[PDB]
C-alpha cells in the first residue's frame, strides 16, 4: 500500500513547478476574446506501463492510482474500452472536493490537480467578467431539447432563463456550498474554449432507479465539446478524454506501452447493435448542419475497421495525442522510478 494514490505525490516540488506555470501561461487579451492558454494546453499525459510487473503487483499499482469504481462501471456497461482495435484507457483517481472537472482536466494535460484553482478561477472570470451572450444562446438552445420543454410542456419567461443563467455563473465560483460547487455541461464547453482543445466525455447513457432498476433519467453529459469560439486552425486537435460516473469526473488516460492497437477513441457508442454517434454539444442550427465537417476540423478523424454485428464495420474515431511532457515537468517519470524501486523491494 506504500504507493501513493496520485501521480503528483511522487514529486510535489515538481508538481508545484507546474502549478506555478499555469497562471503565467494564461493570456487575458484586451480585445474581448475569451482568455486562454498560450502553450500549455498542448501537453498530454500518458500513463506508464503496468503489464511488465507480476499480476499481484499490478493490483497494488492499479488499486493506488486507478479509480476502480468509475473504471468498473464504464467498462462493464460497454461504454469504456469496448473496441478491440484501440488502446485501453484508465481512469486516474480524482479529488471529490467539487472541482473534479478542473481536477480531471488538469490531470489529463499536466498530471497535477487544480489545487490552486487556476482552471476553476479562469472559468469563473470568463462567465462573470466578460460578455457571455453566445454561450447563453447555445445553452438555451440545447436546454430546450435536452430538458424536453415540448415534452414536459414547460414555458420559460425571460426571467426564468436569467435566473438559471445567473445560477450557472454562481456555480462556477469558488464559494462554499463539498468544498466547491459541482459543474455541468455548459461549464465543460466554456472550459474547452478556454483551452482551445476539445473535450470528449465518456459516460453511461442513463441513470438507473434505486427502486426498480429501470431507467430513471438520461445522463446528457457524454459527448463531444468543441472549442467553437475559435478557428479550428488556432486550436489543438487532440482531445481531452474525461470519464463521468456517480457525479464524478476523472481523466481517461492511455497506457504508454501501446501494442498494435491504435491510439484513438471511437466517436461512436455501441448501444443496441447500432453505432450511435456521440452527442456533439451546444451547436447552432447552421453548425449542426455541417456537424461532420466541424468534427473533421477540430479533431483528427480516422476510419477504424471493427467487428460488426460476424462482419467488419467502419467507424469514425479521433486520434489521441502521444505523451509530450518534457522531463522537467513529467511527474509520470518520477512515479515510475518510485514504482520500480518498490518493485525491487517487493521481490523479497
Amino acid at each position: 500500500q506504500v504507493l501513493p494514490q496520485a501521480l503528483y505525490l511522487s514529486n510535489m516540488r515538481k508538481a508545484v513547478k507546474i502549478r506555478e506555470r499555469t497562471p503565467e501561461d494564461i493570456f487575458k487579451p484586451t480585445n474581448g476574446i475569451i482568455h486562454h492558454f498560450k502553450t500549455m494546453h498542448r501537453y498530454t499525459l500518458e500513463m506508464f506501463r503496468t503489464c511488465q510487473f507480476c499480476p499481484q503487483f499490478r493490483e497494488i499499482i492499479h488499486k493506488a492510482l486507478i479509480d476502480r469504481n468509475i473504471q468498473a462501471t464504464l467498462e462493464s456497461q460497454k461504454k469504456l474500452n469496448w473496441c478491440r482495435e484501440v488502446r485501453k484507457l484508465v481512469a486516474l483517481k480524482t479529488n471529490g472536493d467539487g472541482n473534479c472537472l478542473m481536477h480531471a482536466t488538469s490531470q489529463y494535460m499536466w498530471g497535477v490537480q487544480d489545487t490552486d484553482l487556476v482552471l476553476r478561477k479562469a472559468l469563473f472570470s470568463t462567465l462573470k467578467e466578460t460578455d457571455t451572450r453566445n454561450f447563453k444562446f447555445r445553452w438555451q438552445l440545447e436546454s430546450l431539447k435536452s430538458q424536453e420543454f415540448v415534452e414536459t410542456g414547460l414555458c420559460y419567461d425571460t426571467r426564468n432563463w436569467n435566473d438559471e443563467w445567473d445560477n450557472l455563473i454562481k456555480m462556477a465560483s469558488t464559494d462554499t456550498p463539498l468544498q466547491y460547487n459541482s459543474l455541468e455541461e455548459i461549464h465543460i464547453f466554456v472550459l474547452c474554449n478556454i483551452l482551445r482543445r476539445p473535450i470528449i466525455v465518456i459516460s453511461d447513457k442513463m441513470l438507473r432507479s434505486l427502486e426498480s432498476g429501470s431507467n430513471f433519467a438520461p445522463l446528457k453529459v457524454g459527448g463531444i465539446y468543441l472549442p467553437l469560439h475559435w478557428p479550428a486552425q488556432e486550436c489543438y486537435r487532440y482531445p481531452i478524454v474525461l470519464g463521468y460516473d456517480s457525479h464524478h469526473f476523472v481523466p481517461l488516460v492511455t497506457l504508454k506501452d501501446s501494442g498494435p492497437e491504435i491510439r484513438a477513441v471511437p466517436l461512436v457508442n455501441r448501444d443496441r447493435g447500432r453505432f450511435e454517434d456521440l452527442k456533439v454539444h451546444f451547436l447552432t442550427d447552421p453548425e449542426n448542419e455541417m456537424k461532420e465537417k466541424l468534427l473533421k476540423e477540430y479533431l483528427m478523424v480516422i476510419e477504424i475497421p471493427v467487428q460488426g454485428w460476424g462482419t467488419t464495420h467502419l467507424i469514425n474515431a479521433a486520434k489521441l495525442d502521444e505523451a509530450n511532457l518534457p522531463k522537467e515537468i513529467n511527474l509520470v517519470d518520477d512515479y515510475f522510478e518510485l514504482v520500480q524501486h518498490e518493485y525491487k523491494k517487493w521481490q523479497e
Binding site: T152, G153, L154, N160, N215, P218, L219, H247
Partner: protein, 75 residues
Amino acid sequence: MQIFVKTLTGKTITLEVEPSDTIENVKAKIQDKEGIPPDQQRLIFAGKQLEDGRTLSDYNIQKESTLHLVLRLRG
C-alpha cells in the same frame, strides 16, 4: 394524498404528500427515495416550473396529479 412524479424516461414514482407541503418538501421526499439532491431537481406542472417556496395547493395540485421531473445533474 397521493401524487405522481414522472421522469423523461416515463418512469413514474408515487409520493405521499399533504396539500400544505411546500415544493422543497416534495423535492425532499424525492431525494430520500431516489438519492437525487434538491438543487438538481426541477418540477414542472401545467407548463410552470414549480418554485421551492410555494405550497402544493398554491399550484392547485390535487390528489392523483402528475408532476414532471427534469434533472440538472452536476459533477
